[model samples]
Target: EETEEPIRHAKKNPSEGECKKACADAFANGDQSKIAKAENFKDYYCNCHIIIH
Candidate 1:
C-alpha cells in the first residue's frame, strides 16, 4: 500500500463582515501584481466555506 493523502480536512467559515470586505477588496483592486491576492479574495468571499487540509 503506497497511498498518501491529507491527515485531516476541515471546513472553515468566516464572519459575514469579513467576507464583504474581501469581496470589496477584490472588486476594487484590479492590478496584475495583485491578481493572486484578488483571486484568493474573490474565491474566499464567494465560497464561504473553505476546505482545509
Candidate 2:
C-alpha cells in the first residue's frame, strides 16, 4: 500500500469514499491504468473475482 498527499484534498483521511471518488475521477480523467495499478492487489485478486470475472 502507498500513501500520497492529494494536491487538491490535502489533510483529509483517504477513506474508502474518498478513494472511490478519487478513482472515479481518475477514470473520468482517462487514467484507467493508474486506477488498475492503485487497486489493493490482494483484496482485488482475492475478493474481486465477482467484479473482475
Candidate 3:
C-alpha cells in the first residue's frame, strides 16, 4: 500500500537517551517541529518507559 501522512514518532529511537538525543540533535542540527512533541520525546516517553519501567 502507498503511504499517507508520515508515521507518528517514526523518528523515535528505541531508547530513552537516544530518543532525547535524537530530539536534541534535531534541534542542534536545526530542525525543530513543535515544542510539545520535542518535549514529549525528551521526557514523556523516557520517563514513562525507562525510569519507572
Candidate 4:
C-alpha cells in the first residue's frame, strides 16, 4: 500500500495557479488535494485541505 500525507498550509498568499498545480499533484499522488481557507486570510492561496470547522 502507498502512504502519503497532505501538504501543509503555506501561510502566504500568492498566485492562485500555484494552489491548483499543487492540488493536482497531490491528487495525482493519491493524497489530499483540497485547499484550506485560513480565518485570517479567508482565501485559498495556500496548499492545504478543508477545515473541520
Candidate 5:
C-alpha cells in the first residue's frame, strides 16, 4: 500500500490596495527602506506560487 503525503495549503491573498496604503504610510512616516522592502516583498515571496492555478 502506498501512503499519500499531506497537501500544502496555498497562502492568503495580500490586498493590493491595503499593501499600497501601508507602503505609502511607511514612506510618509520616513521609512523609505521599509517602503521599498514591502513593495517588493510580495513579489519575491508569492509571485511564482500565485500563478500556479
Candidate 6:
C-alpha cells in the first residue's frame, strides 16, 4: 500500500503556464526533452480548448 505524505511538500512539476509556454516555445527552439514533456500541448492548450468550448 502507498504511504501517506508525512508533511506537505512543494510540487516538483512545473506550473500550468510554465508547461504551456515551454510547450509553445519547444517546437520553435527544438528542445527535445522539454518538447516531450509539453506533450504537444494536447491536454491543456490549443487543441484542448477548441473542443472543450
> Which candidate number has the best lDDT?
4
**lDDT score at residue 3, model 4, on the 0-100 scale:** 28
Per-candidate Cα lDDT values, in order, are 0.30, 0.33, 0.32, 0.41, 0.31, 0.32
Which residue pairs collide, candidate 4? Answer: none
Mind giving the per-residue lDDT tens digits that candidate 6 earns over 1-53? Answer: 22111211123444544553444353435343333232122333321111111
TM-score of each: 0.33, 0.31, 0.29, 0.33, 0.30, 0.30
Cα deviation of 6 in candidate 4 (Å)? 9.3
Model 6 bad stretches (over 4 Å) = 1-11, 28-53
RMSD of each: 12.6, 10.0, 12.1, 8.2, 14.6, 13.7
In the range 28-51, model 4's lDDT, one tens digit per residue, is 442333434212223434433442
Model 2, position 31: C-alpha lDDT score: 35
Give per-candidate clash totals. Answer: 0, 0, 0, 0, 0, 0
Evaluation by TM-score, superior candidate among 2 and 6:
2
Error of 2 at 24 (Å): 0.1
Model 2 residue pairs with clashes: none
Q: Ranking under lDDT, best-scoring first?
A: 4, 2, 3, 6, 5, 1
Q: Give one digit per residue, the lDDT tens place, for model 3 in 1-53.
A: 21111112333444543444444444334332321232233323422221111
| Model 2 lDDT tens row, 1-53 | 32332223222345444444455454445333333223222322211111121
Query: Which digits, one per residue and each the tens of the lDDT, describe model 1 over residues 1-53?
Result: 22121111121344544443443444434222222221222322332222122
Model 3 TM-score on a 0 to 1 scale: 0.29
Stretches of candidate 3 off by over 4 Å are 1-13, 30-53
The whole-model C-alpha lDDT of candidate 6 against the native structure comes to 0.32
